[PDB]
Design a protein around this ligand. Sequence first.
Ligand SMILES: CC(C)(C)c1nc(-c2cccc(NS(=O)(=O)c3c(F)cccc3F)c2F)c(-c2ccnc(N)n2)s1
Length: 258
Amino acid sequence: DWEIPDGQITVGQRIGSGSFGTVYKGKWHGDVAVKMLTPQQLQAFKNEVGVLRKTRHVNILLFMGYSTKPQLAIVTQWCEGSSLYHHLHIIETKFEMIKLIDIARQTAQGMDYLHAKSIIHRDLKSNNIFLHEDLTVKIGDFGLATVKSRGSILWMAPEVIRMQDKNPYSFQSDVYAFGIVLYELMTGQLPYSNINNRDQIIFMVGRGYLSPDLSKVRSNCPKAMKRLMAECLKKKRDERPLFPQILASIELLARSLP
Ligand SMILES: CC(C)(C)c1nc(-c2cccc(NS(=O)(=O)c3c(F)cccc3F)c2F)c(-c2ccnc(N)n2)s1
């Protein structure tokens, strides 16, 4: 099994909380990430998502094992560096166009893998794309439904925001969230920056009145990159390309660049 013997993990600094559980930097055969959760949270993740079992890919965060005592936790590999969100919006890292294209290429590579294994991320955003050693993209923080009837909206597809569906999530919703990530890479900015109201952004994006300002893309951004971005951000989910097609477009772009 993947159960780490009781008392082997040293738990350190609290990193934060994602879709589910609290992340702490830890030590177990070097630096590791320790995601604390409840047995109900762990069982739901194994059923509703199942990335711990299913994924073993260079662009997906590597699961390592779990602990039962003192507290239940998922132990993954540790990413040395920062998330794409942190790089672009917190510390304003100026990446070369070649690198920005590579980050997109690597993200689309990981997404195509997940989708081929029939896994929908449901919560892809820039603080989920971890730039390990500032070179390798590692996709983590998978979406898990923790709440019922009776949050980062900038990446949500209009249909996800409208939520007139029980499960508005699809491969196409992840394509939209990737579209926003492409926007962030090519502009170095977050969409709808000129609006100071979360409710107005939610209402308008869902109703298709508001969409990212594509005129904000860098001068050195390839025409095909801006074209792919537009296709991924289509308001009609059906009009969006899937990741095998997205990947092929980036891979072709990556070589056609002088
Ligand atoms: C607080 C915040 C921003 C949300 C973070 N979460 C994780 C983290 C820690 C543990 C697991 C998952 N993701 S997960 O829980 O979806 C998951 C697994 F539990 C197993 C395998 C892949 C995987 F993505 C994470 F995103 C972070 C994390 C993970 C690895 N290295 C570093 N440096 N940070 S940071």
